[PDB]
Short mmCIF file of C-alpha atoms and ligand atoms in Angstrom, two decimals:
data_model
loop_
_atom_site.label_atom_id
_atom_site.label_comp_id
_atom_site.label_asym_id
_atom_site.label_seq_id
_atom_site.Cartn_x
_atom_site.Cartn_y
_atom_site.Cartn_z
CA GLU A 1 26.12 -16.11 -3.68
CA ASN A 2 24.76 -13.89 0.05
CA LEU A 3 26.41 -14.01 3.77
CA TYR A 4 22.58 -15.52 5.19
CA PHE A 5 24.04 -18.52 2.79
CA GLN A 6 26.22 -19.63 5.29
CA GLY A 7 26.37 -18.87 9.21
CA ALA A 8 25.69 -15.76 10.83
CA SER A 9 27.64 -13.87 13.55
CA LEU A 10 24.60 -12.16 16.39
CA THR A 11 25.33 -8.74 14.52
CA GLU A 12 24.70 -10.21 10.80
CA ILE A 13 21.20 -12.02 12.58
CA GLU A 14 20.06 -7.99 14.01
CA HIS A 15 21.22 -6.74 10.47
CA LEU A 16 18.97 -9.16 9.13
CA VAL A 17 15.71 -8.70 11.07
CA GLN A 18 16.55 -4.84 10.44
CA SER A 19 16.22 -6.09 6.70
CA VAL A 20 13.23 -8.27 7.09
CA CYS A 21 11.25 -5.18 8.94
CA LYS A 22 12.38 -2.92 6.35
CA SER A 23 11.79 -5.37 3.24
CA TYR A 24 8.08 -6.08 4.38
CA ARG A 25 7.34 -2.18 5.69
CA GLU A 26 7.68 -1.54 1.70
CA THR A 27 5.48 -4.10 0.05
CA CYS A 28 2.95 -4.98 2.62
CA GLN A 29 -0.15 -3.71 0.54
CA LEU A 30 -2.51 -1.69 3.03
CA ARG A 31 -1.58 0.58 5.77
CA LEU A 32 -2.34 -0.97 8.76
CA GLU A 33 -3.42 2.42 9.78
CA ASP A 34 -5.75 2.44 7.06
CA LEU A 35 -7.28 -0.96 8.02
CA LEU A 36 -7.47 0.57 11.81
CA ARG A 37 -9.40 3.33 10.99
CA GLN A 38 -11.74 1.43 8.21
CA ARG A 39 -13.38 -0.67 10.73
CA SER A 40 -16.36 1.20 11.54
CA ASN A 41 -16.87 1.84 7.95
CA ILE A 42 -18.95 -1.73 6.69
CA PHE A 43 -21.36 -2.74 4.54
CA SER A 44 -25.05 -2.54 5.40
CA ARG A 45 -27.41 -5.61 4.86
CA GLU A 46 -28.52 -3.55 1.26
CA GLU A 47 -24.48 -4.10 0.13
CA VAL A 48 -24.42 -7.56 1.27
CA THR A 49 -27.40 -8.31 -0.56
CA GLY A 50 -26.23 -7.18 -3.91
CA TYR A 51 -22.53 -9.23 -3.18
CA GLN A 52 -24.99 -12.33 -2.60
CA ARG A 53 -26.65 -11.21 -6.22
CA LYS A 54 -23.91 -11.48 -7.70
CA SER A 55 -23.34 -14.52 -10.19
CA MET A 56 -20.71 -17.24 -8.71
CA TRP A 57 -18.48 -16.67 -11.57
CA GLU A 58 -18.68 -12.61 -11.07
CA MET A 59 -17.37 -13.49 -7.54
CA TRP A 60 -15.06 -15.47 -8.59
CA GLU A 61 -13.54 -13.39 -10.74
CA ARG A 62 -13.44 -10.67 -8.38
CA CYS A 63 -11.44 -12.48 -5.88
CA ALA A 64 -8.94 -14.08 -8.13
CA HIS A 65 -7.98 -10.29 -8.93
CA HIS A 66 -7.72 -9.78 -5.22
CA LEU A 67 -5.39 -12.47 -4.44
CA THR A 68 -3.52 -11.55 -7.75
CA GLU A 69 -3.17 -7.98 -6.69
CA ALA A 70 -1.91 -9.50 -2.77
CA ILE A 71 0.40 -11.85 -4.08
CA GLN A 72 2.39 -8.99 -6.83
CA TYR A 73 2.80 -7.38 -3.58
CA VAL A 74 4.23 -10.98 -2.26
CA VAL A 75 6.77 -11.71 -5.00
CA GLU A 76 7.88 -7.80 -4.15
CA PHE A 77 8.45 -9.00 -0.69
CA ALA A 78 10.36 -12.22 -1.83
CA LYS A 79 12.34 -9.94 -4.63
CA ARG A 80 13.74 -7.21 -1.30
CA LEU A 81 14.07 -10.62 1.22
CA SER A 82 18.09 -11.14 1.79
CA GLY A 83 19.30 -14.16 -0.44
CA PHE A 84 16.27 -14.96 -1.96
CA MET A 85 17.85 -13.09 -5.79
CA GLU A 86 20.78 -14.70 -5.28
CA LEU A 87 18.44 -18.44 -5.28
CA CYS A 88 18.42 -20.30 -8.86
CA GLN A 89 15.36 -18.71 -10.50
CA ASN A 90 14.02 -22.52 -10.43
CA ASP A 91 14.34 -21.97 -6.64
CA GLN A 92 12.75 -18.59 -6.91
CA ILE A 93 9.38 -20.13 -8.26
CA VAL A 94 9.12 -23.11 -6.62
CA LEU A 95 8.99 -21.09 -3.73
CA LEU A 96 7.03 -18.37 -4.81
CA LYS A 97 4.11 -20.92 -6.45
CA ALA A 98 4.05 -22.94 -2.88
CA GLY A 99 4.35 -19.85 -0.24
CA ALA A 100 3.10 -16.29 -2.39
CA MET A 101 -0.71 -17.73 -1.42
CA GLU A 102 0.26 -18.77 1.93
CA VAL A 103 2.28 -15.17 2.93
CA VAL A 104 -0.99 -13.97 1.91
CA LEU A 105 -2.97 -15.67 4.13
CA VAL A 106 -1.06 -14.97 7.02
CA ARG A 107 -0.56 -10.83 5.51
CA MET A 108 -5.23 -11.00 5.57
CA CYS A 109 -5.11 -10.90 9.51
CA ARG A 110 -4.39 -7.59 9.17
CA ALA A 111 -7.35 -6.94 7.43
CA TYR A 112 -9.44 -8.58 9.41
CA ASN A 113 -11.35 -7.88 12.76
CA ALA A 114 -11.87 -10.28 15.26
CA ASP A 115 -14.18 -7.74 16.82
CA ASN A 116 -17.23 -8.12 14.77
CA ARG A 117 -15.87 -11.05 12.33
CA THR A 118 -15.70 -9.12 8.75
CA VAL A 119 -12.87 -8.39 6.86
CA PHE A 120 -12.07 -5.75 4.83
CA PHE A 121 -13.17 -6.37 0.94
CA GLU A 122 -13.62 -3.20 -1.61
CA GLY A 123 -13.27 -0.96 0.54
CA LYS A 124 -15.62 -1.49 3.86
CA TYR A 125 -15.83 -4.62 6.03
CA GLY A 126 -17.99 -7.54 5.60
CA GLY A 127 -18.75 -10.61 7.52
CA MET A 128 -18.44 -14.14 5.44
CA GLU A 129 -21.50 -13.74 4.19
CA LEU A 130 -20.29 -11.44 1.43
CA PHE A 131 -18.92 -14.15 -0.32
CA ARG A 132 -21.94 -16.63 -0.36
CA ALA A 133 -22.16 -16.40 -4.37
CA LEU A 134 -18.54 -18.07 -4.62
CA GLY A 135 -20.18 -21.81 -3.26
CA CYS A 136 -17.18 -22.37 -1.52
CA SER A 137 -18.42 -21.95 2.24
CA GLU A 138 -16.18 -24.27 3.58
CA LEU A 139 -13.04 -23.13 2.57
CA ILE A 140 -14.11 -19.25 3.61
CA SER A 141 -15.02 -20.15 7.15
CA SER A 142 -11.40 -21.63 6.91
CA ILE A 143 -10.23 -18.83 5.80
CA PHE A 144 -12.13 -16.42 8.25
CA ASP A 145 -10.78 -19.09 11.28
CA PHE A 146 -7.52 -18.57 10.02
CA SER A 147 -7.73 -15.14 10.59
CA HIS A 148 -9.01 -15.00 13.76
CA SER A 149 -6.48 -17.50 15.22
CA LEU A 150 -3.88 -15.73 13.76
CA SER A 151 -5.93 -12.47 14.95
CA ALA A 152 -6.24 -13.74 18.68
CA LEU A 153 -2.02 -14.10 18.75
CA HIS A 154 -2.27 -9.43 18.32
CA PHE A 155 0.75 -9.71 16.10
CA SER A 156 3.12 -6.89 15.54
CA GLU A 157 4.16 -5.15 12.06
CA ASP A 158 7.89 -6.13 13.03
CA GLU A 159 6.14 -10.10 14.17
CA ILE A 160 4.34 -10.39 10.36
CA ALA A 161 7.18 -9.68 8.48
CA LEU A 162 10.03 -12.43 9.87
CA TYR A 163 7.07 -14.56 10.01
CA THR A 164 6.32 -14.69 6.73
CA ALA A 165 9.83 -14.16 5.76
CA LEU A 166 10.34 -17.57 7.19
CA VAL A 167 6.88 -18.91 6.02
CA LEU A 168 8.36 -18.38 2.00
CA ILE A 169 11.67 -19.80 3.16
CA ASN A 170 10.89 -23.18 3.62
CA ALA A 171 13.54 -25.52 2.47
CA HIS A 172 11.24 -28.54 2.23
CA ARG A 173 9.55 -27.64 -0.66
CA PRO A 174 9.89 -30.29 -3.28
CA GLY A 175 11.52 -29.09 -6.22
CA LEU A 176 13.97 -27.18 -4.52
CA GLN A 177 17.47 -27.60 -6.90
CA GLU A 178 19.90 -25.10 -3.88
CA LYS A 179 18.46 -26.83 -1.09
CA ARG A 180 21.20 -26.50 1.36
CA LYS A 181 21.32 -23.23 0.45
CA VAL A 182 17.55 -22.75 0.97
CA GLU A 183 18.37 -24.71 4.31
CA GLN A 184 20.88 -21.85 5.56
CA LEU A 185 19.15 -18.94 4.37
CA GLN A 186 15.73 -20.69 6.31
CA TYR A 187 18.55 -21.25 9.78
CA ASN A 188 19.57 -17.67 9.44
CA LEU A 189 16.09 -16.39 9.15
CA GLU A 190 15.05 -18.33 12.26
CA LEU A 191 17.14 -17.03 14.45
CA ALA A 192 16.23 -13.46 13.09
CA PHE A 193 12.63 -13.93 13.93
CA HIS A 194 13.38 -15.74 17.02
CA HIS A 195 15.73 -13.15 18.15
CA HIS A 196 13.32 -10.75 17.65
CA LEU A 197 10.78 -12.48 19.49
CA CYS A 198 13.85 -13.09 22.71
CA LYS A 199 14.29 -9.26 22.88
CA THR A 200 10.84 -8.67 22.81
CA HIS A 201 9.94 -10.67 25.63
CA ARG A 202 7.39 -12.43 22.92
CA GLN A 203 9.19 -15.54 22.52
CA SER A 204 5.20 -17.49 24.07
CA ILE A 205 3.82 -17.39 20.62
CA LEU A 206 5.77 -19.59 19.34
CA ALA A 207 3.27 -22.34 20.64
CA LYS A 208 0.96 -20.55 19.55
CA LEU A 209 1.44 -20.27 15.48
CA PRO A 210 0.00 -22.62 13.58
CA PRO A 211 1.52 -26.37 12.33
CA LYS A 212 2.29 -25.85 8.60
CA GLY A 213 -0.05 -28.28 7.86
CA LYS A 214 -2.86 -26.01 8.51
CA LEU A 215 -1.88 -23.20 5.88
CA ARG A 216 -1.21 -26.30 3.75
CA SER A 217 -4.78 -27.25 3.95
CA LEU A 218 -5.78 -24.03 2.99
CA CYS A 219 -3.54 -24.37 0.16
CA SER A 220 -5.19 -27.39 -0.88
CA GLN A 221 -8.07 -26.38 -0.72
CA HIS A 222 -8.31 -23.30 -2.42
CA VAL A 223 -7.09 -25.24 -5.59
CA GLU A 224 -10.09 -27.92 -4.71
CA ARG A 225 -12.46 -25.18 -5.22
CA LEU A 226 -10.45 -23.71 -7.52
CA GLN A 227 -10.72 -26.99 -9.96
CA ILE A 228 -14.61 -27.66 -9.19
CA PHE A 229 -15.37 -23.35 -10.19
CA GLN A 230 -12.75 -24.03 -13.43
CA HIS A 231 -14.85 -27.51 -14.65
CA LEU A 232 -18.04 -24.89 -14.34
CA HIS A 233 -16.71 -22.18 -15.91
CA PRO A 234 -13.96 -22.96 -17.42
CA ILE A 235 -14.26 -20.55 -20.24
CA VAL A 236 -14.43 -17.59 -17.30
CA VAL A 237 -11.52 -19.45 -15.93
CA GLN A 238 -9.73 -18.92 -19.85
CA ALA A 239 -10.36 -15.70 -20.50
CA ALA A 240 -10.97 -13.60 -17.27
CA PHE A 241 -8.84 -14.74 -14.63
CA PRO A 242 -5.74 -13.39 -14.42
CA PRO A 243 -2.31 -15.23 -15.81
CA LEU A 244 -0.56 -14.85 -12.41
CA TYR A 245 -3.27 -16.68 -10.52
CA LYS A 246 -3.58 -19.21 -12.91
CA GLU A 247 0.46 -19.80 -13.62
CA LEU A 248 0.41 -19.95 -9.29
CA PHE A 249 -3.06 -22.61 -9.31
CA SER A 250 -3.68 -24.11 -12.57
CA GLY A 251 -0.67 -24.40 -13.86
CA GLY A 252 -0.77 -21.77 -16.27
CA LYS B 1 0.60 -21.94 -20.31
CA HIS B 2 0.68 -18.36 -18.95
CA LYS B 3 4.46 -17.91 -17.63
CA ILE B 4 3.92 -14.39 -15.60
CA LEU B 5 6.22 -14.98 -12.14
CA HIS B 6 9.70 -15.29 -15.16
CA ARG B 7 8.73 -11.26 -15.65
CA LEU B 8 8.36 -10.25 -12.40
CA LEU B 9 11.37 -11.62 -10.90
CA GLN B 10 13.56 -9.82 -14.16
CA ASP B 11 11.48 -6.41 -14.06
CA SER B 12 13.79 -4.38 -12.37
O1 VYI C 1 -11.40 -11.53 -2.68
S1 VYI C 1 -10.71 -11.26 -1.00
O2 VYI C 1 -10.77 -9.93 -0.91
C1 VYI C 1 -11.03 -12.12 -0.15
C2 VYI C 1 -10.71 -11.77 1.96
C3 VYI C 1 -11.47 -12.95 2.36
C4 VYI C 1 -11.96 -14.25 1.67
F1 VYI C 1 -11.91 -14.81 2.95
C5 VYI C 1 -12.62 -14.63 0.79
C6 VYI C 1 -11.35 -13.56 -0.41
N1 VYI C 1 -8.74 -11.15 -0.78
C7 VYI C 1 -7.59 -10.93 -0.32
C8 VYI C 1 -8.09 -12.01 1.18
O3 VYI C 1 -6.74 -12.65 -0.09
C9 VYI C 1 -7.19 -13.75 -0.51
C10 VYI C 1 -7.12 -15.02 1.15
C11 VYI C 1 -7.52 -16.50 0.08
C12 VYI C 1 -8.08 -16.36 -1.49
C13 VYI C 1 -8.42 -15.30 -1.93
N2 VYI C 1 -9.33 -15.12 -2.94
C14 VYI C 1 -10.34 -16.45 -3.10
C15 VYI C 1 -11.27 -17.01 -2.42
C16 VYI C 1 -11.63 -18.11 -2.66
C17 VYI C 1 -11.72 -18.10 -4.14
C18 VYI C 1 -11.24 -17.71 -4.89
C19 VYI C 1 -10.05 -16.53 -4.62
F2 VYI C 1 -9.49 -15.83 -5.46
C20 VYI C 1 -7.96 -14.16 -1.18
C21 VYI C 1 -8.55 -12.43 -1.82
#
């Protein structure tokens, strides 16, 4: 159903690098230029205190909606990715259910400022203390550490494009019906990413990329903390959490 | 029983 479900030549791999970088550029949610410009715009002590005084449920609802907005851009990225729309609907949903949160966790390093350990949230930069009302301090600290580690790699926009395409197209996800088609698309996207790193003298980042188990651990922690919150405020999740968020993380 | 992904995937 697609050229990239079979062996691709060097010229086809070059074409794939460009296509992936284009798909990412058109769906990145926030502009890198905007994120860097806004670094000097930091929440005041008064503003941090205001977020800390919010109820646990109010903060969970806000963060669930921010995650859902980010995920909607990843769904559009997937739709634009060569070969993804040629996979069967079962497989597209398996790949998105397993990988959309992983892609958001990678993308968010762009919005993280390693100089002062702050993230861009609701118009300004704030530290992990902004999220204290959620009552999931280990998960927040793990997300900040993850962004800090990716920030140390000094990714270009094109490297994030290619690395996130590969995070999404993972033939090991349980539930894939057309596993061999996904394996070949993954192989070609791996070649595109590695070709780009070779061409730009950036192959040294490969040994520095986080292990898959790290992204899995973050996703598992998020689902675990959500289950704890849901037990405390079931009607908040039922009535006020976004439907897409529930489809991805609380089985509908 | 929320199903949104199928709508997003099928919307052009
Ligand atoms: O709320 S966020 O600004 C944010 C920014 C930085 C953090 F450490 C935490 C939240 N937003 C964008 C970053 O992507 C992620 C990535 C992961 C999670 C979430 N949310 C989330 C967090 C905790 C519980 C329920 C949740 F839904 C978001 C959502």
